[PDB]
Symmetry: C4
Subunit: 334 residues, 4 copies
């Protein structure tokens, strides 16, 4: 039995090799942005409403054309076979059964067509390749396989400096490969090339500046993920949760606005929603559950998060996610 | 001898079984709101006034028709026989002798008519039952027994997630029962049904949003308790003390405005009064005193709090509680 | 050799009995205001000026008619024979030799006439007695003995709750007495009675509210000490240093504005001056020096503080205390 | 291998004698300003931009007439032979090879002409001597030797109180001398005397007040260093990083505005640039590298900093230092 997401982190540290746990847990540089993602959520307090009708509380949302059971998707995390032998297939099967979208990675350790064949709501995360034609081919493969959205990661012109990995001399085991297979920095021109070559919604992941959110809408994005990449890219980048309210105001409903970084409970989902997010992504906790107990571990994590989101929404007087977005918040200390 | 409320917490932890201490002390989730109730009070500093006439300092107030000896009532705490064999009768007798109102719980472990027969100023706390007729019958019983106010708890559509209890596998011992005897979420319609069926003042406990305080006045409430339920309901709910000043301004004298959560000294009572509260509720410390020494323990706690309130008021230049409400405050760090 | 005021606190804790150290060090209640006096000073940063003429840096000020060598006086501290057999005479002799005013206490353990005969700049601190005629007699004695100012303590309608003393069962040894010999709360009427019966400047010690500072000027006070009594009176009273700037602005030069609480270095003196103080009082450190080494210990403390004040002023570009009062400040974190 | 500047501090503490490590690491007084330099940088978060052209990212700047490879110079640090037998020559050779300006100190342990003969971009740091004619002779020597800028230190009318040194009884070993050879406080008149006697840009180091930055431009300075002298001068002086944005706005492009104090990574360089600095100085880390490994240690430090600056700039969407100065920032907690 697991009663919080923190129970799963302890289970995963026992089972995984140290250097793989460090690859999962770590950030870039001094890990200032990794810690700040948690500090920022801990400073937000919700002002709940009372005495509202809760006869039919629902945690469902509609996003990118489809119903999802929670305002949550599994974040893209590369190389999931590092954590469990069934890797991405275990996570995708659990996400499908929970009604949660799963983001298939460009650097998945099982091919995107195999993961898409599990069913559910697969999205596909794109890293730009040095060849525009090859980049567009991955997009076309994902679309042909039934992925519903292209999550274009825009905060990785190159990878950040993971000092835990450097100190550990970490490298991919020979038994893990990039099953979909030279990368290059993406620009606004790359976004337009993707947008022109797919009918799927393009979601830009890694936006933090208000004018980049506005330009994303102008560029035809269907969504953005407000994110500092889990503290793994620029060390010292502001947490997404601290930019979210200002970005939601600036886009004025022109695209979906997701957030990630440090979501560790249903109450954290409520905080993100109250600051204006359409939905959240969850990364590390899903891998903790995968490492601890495979598919069934991910299922249990998603069941726990669903219960915690429903509990927080109802205690805050919200019969729907839209009502949660109209909650007010107040910043505290520590 | 006890010289602070903290002396009593140590005494209670020695005597009570661990799982009962945890039921008393704990909050929901990560206990963020439980800790924030204390952090928020610790950040408030009073600006005392000097050189005023203190010849007749009095801590008395008039509330809901009657004089009380302090601006304080005993909060509703379910199942007091968990803490001492005389349970609610011990606490009610001490409250009566101290001139403090005592709130009888819907989930009391001694019947409401027995506790009311102790005398004093009994109030009655209502949890809404799935049957409107049954809810109104508890209200009628309380009124017929001489309770003076109905404290309708409005922040419990269901109970929060008490992880200490889950981890402990805590359950009520067979020797403790709900001596007044299926609950359902209350709405504004339930408030109107109560208001229409009693002449007693109805006090809504668990209000945190300014518009819910305004609606409470519009709904005919005689008072509200600004409260996050001791951090036991929504984890991440703002402390009542952080909303109190804005709520007092918005109701403009239209009802009494009480606060609870973390009051641990007479100086904390002064802080709440200076932020505009009409009175406070005190929960956990009363149970510490009950566990440590029964009726006499509660008597000693209330005598200590009375001395500390009188001391703080006089040192701040206040000959009455109304003068304390006109004190100014300044927020500090830590 | 002592290179900071903290060296002296360690020396005093070694020599004094625990219960006397606790009487000296402690505050009221939870000691929130005692700690806040230090936290508040630690949050202030000075913006120094460069490239100014420092050919004749002087730390002298004129106050209450007389030159003082530093913008500093020894605070009133009762019963100095608790700390060293020569008690007040040792401290007064060192203050005289350093050119610092010394405040003789109503509760001195050597008579006020003996301490005044040491010479120097004696001020006299008054606690109001239940008999107006007796209060005025102490004032007359002080004036006849050559005291230069009456420091009327206005924050003690009664003594605060010193929990260290209660826990220690602390009482005055039989060998310490109130050598000047039933007290009562002072009011604005008591201030007028003192003002009408002396030509000396009357200084109200313990003012924290801006309107009480304004009323003090209206009442004919020659000065005020902005002070929470070293955290020994109302627990939760704001630190004087946090009210000082607003009070200096409100009195508009109408009286001298001193501050106390937590001054532990020449840099702290500079901070107080930059926030607008005319001078500071220093309490506990003087007693540490007395306990550690008697008269010579106090001399060494005052020499160290004089060097630190001169050093801080010059490094901040200030050739006079008036220039230091025109420095700007910026609040930081921790 | 060193992967952060913190790796070098540990290496230097192992090798150096304790009292020399303390001379290097320490600040004045309670070291409040030393700690605040780090706290202030840790509170700044960058808002990175995405999707910009990074084809030709360059870290170069033009300053005082010449290209530098990074927006960084080696700060003046006296007596470098305390840390390694080759002292200043080792550091200057590494700075030259990295394309970084090196500031030669008035109190260098190798003569200024020897260090200038290494080549590179030498600047010269001036302490004002009691004799105007002698001060101007050091300036003339530096100019004749090929130094490119005069860095006039304006925050040392005398040295601050280094309590670590006092406690250690620290003194210069007989084998270290002031190889360029009675000092006096500098004033605005001294600045004019220097400005009139050289064609080199005069840079005032140690400015914190906005009006002193404005007066520096009016006085003909080519630059200023916004600095509290590494926390070694006035204890309680505000960190330069907290004044930088307001100073950059007030000088309106009238001179170069550098900053120092606590720069420990390329991300810290990015923060300073985003707050408006033209370049930074780095002091203690260069000495850590010198102590740990001589010339090669300094080379490795400068290579690590160059990689970290390039990494942070690109991750923040900046192809040039000018673009980094247009980044926005947001203050956080801890
Ligand atoms: C081990 C690991 C690998 C990741 N790989 C990718 C990736 O391939 N593509 C991507 O866009 N984000 C990647 N991310 C970032 C996540 O999508 C997400 O932004 C971050 O993990 C969210 O924060 P959380 O882990 O705090 O929930 C990775 C994160 C981790 C921890
Ligand atoms: C053990 C326990 C049981 C409680 N039971 C009730 C209850 O039956 N009804 C209710 O309205 N509040 C209940 N409360 C909340 C209290 O009335 C009160 O809001 C909270 O304890 C006040 O904070 P304090 O304990 O910090 O003083 C309970 C609190 C505790 C600790
Ligand atoms: C042991 C002790 C005794 C004191 N006695 C008096 C007193 O008799 N009269 C008075 O006005 N203040 C008294 N004070 C308060 C001081 O004058 C002063 O306000 C406080 O000590 C200043 O703070 P500091 O000790 O932090 O420097 C006393 C303080 C201490 C610690
Ligand atoms: C050991 C030491 C000696 C220094 N000597 C000088 C000096 O001779 N002249 C000067 O202007 N600054 C001197 N400084 C100050 C530095 O130039 C610089 O302002 C401070 O070290 C920068 O901060 P950082 O060390 O945190 O990078 C010295 C600093 C240190 C630590
Ligand atoms: O995006 C991330 O943070 C990743 O860790 C993705 C990744 C994983 C392994 C190699 C390169 C990028
Ligand atoms: O209101 C609370 O916090 C309670 O703990 C009340 C309660 C106690 C036991 C079972 C259900 C509700
Ligand atoms: O003013 C104070 O804080 C004192 O401690 C004065 C004092 C000392 C001893 C008894 C009563 C008052
Ligand atoms: O400027 C500093 O902080 C120095 O430490 C310079 C210095 C070094 C040794 C003696 C005097 C000044």
């Amino acid at each position: 039995t697991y009663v919080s997401l923190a129970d799963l982190e302890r289970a995963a540290r026992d089972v995984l090799p140290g250097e793989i746990f460090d690859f999962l847990a770590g950030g870039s540089g001094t890990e200032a942005s990794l810690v700040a993602n948690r500090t920022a959520l801990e400073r937000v307090f919700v002002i709940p409403r009372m005495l509202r009708d809760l006869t039919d509380v629902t945690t469902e949302i509609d996003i990118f054309g489809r119903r999802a059971a929670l305002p949550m998707a599994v974040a893209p995390v590369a190389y999931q076979r590092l954590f469990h032998p069934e890797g991405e297939l275990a996570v995708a099967r659990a996400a499908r059964d929970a009604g949660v979208p799963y983001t298939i990675c460009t650097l998945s350790s099982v091919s995107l067509e195999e993961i898409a064949a599990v069913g559910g709501r697969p999205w596909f995360q794109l890293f730009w390749l040095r060849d525009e034609k090859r980049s567009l081919d991955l997009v076309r493969r994902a679309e042909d396989a039934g992925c519903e959205a292209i999550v274009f990661t825009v905060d990785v012109p190159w990878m950040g400096r993971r000092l835990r990995d450097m100190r550990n001399g970490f490298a991919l085991p020979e038994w893990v490969t990039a099953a979909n297979f030279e990368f290059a920095p993406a620009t606004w021109e790359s976004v337009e090339a993707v947008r022109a070559h797919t009918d799927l919604p393009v979601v830009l992941k890694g936006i933090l500046a208000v004018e980049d959110a506005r330009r994303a809408v102008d560029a035809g994005a269907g969504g953005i993920v407000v994110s500092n990449h889990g503290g793994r890219q620029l060390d010292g980048a502001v947490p997404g949760i601290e930019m979210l309210g200002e970005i939601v105001a600036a886009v004025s409903g022109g695209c979906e606005v997701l957030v990630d970084g440090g979501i560790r409970s249903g109450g954290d989902v409520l905080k993100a929603t109250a600051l204006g997010a359409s939905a959240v992504l969850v990364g590390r906790p899903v891998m903790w559950a995968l490492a601890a107990a495979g598919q069934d571990g991910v299922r249990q994590l998603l069941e726990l998060l669903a219960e915690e989101v429903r509990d927080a929404m109802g205690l805050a007087g919200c019969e729907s996610v839209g009502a949660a977005r109209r909650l007010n918040t107040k910043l505290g200390v520590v």
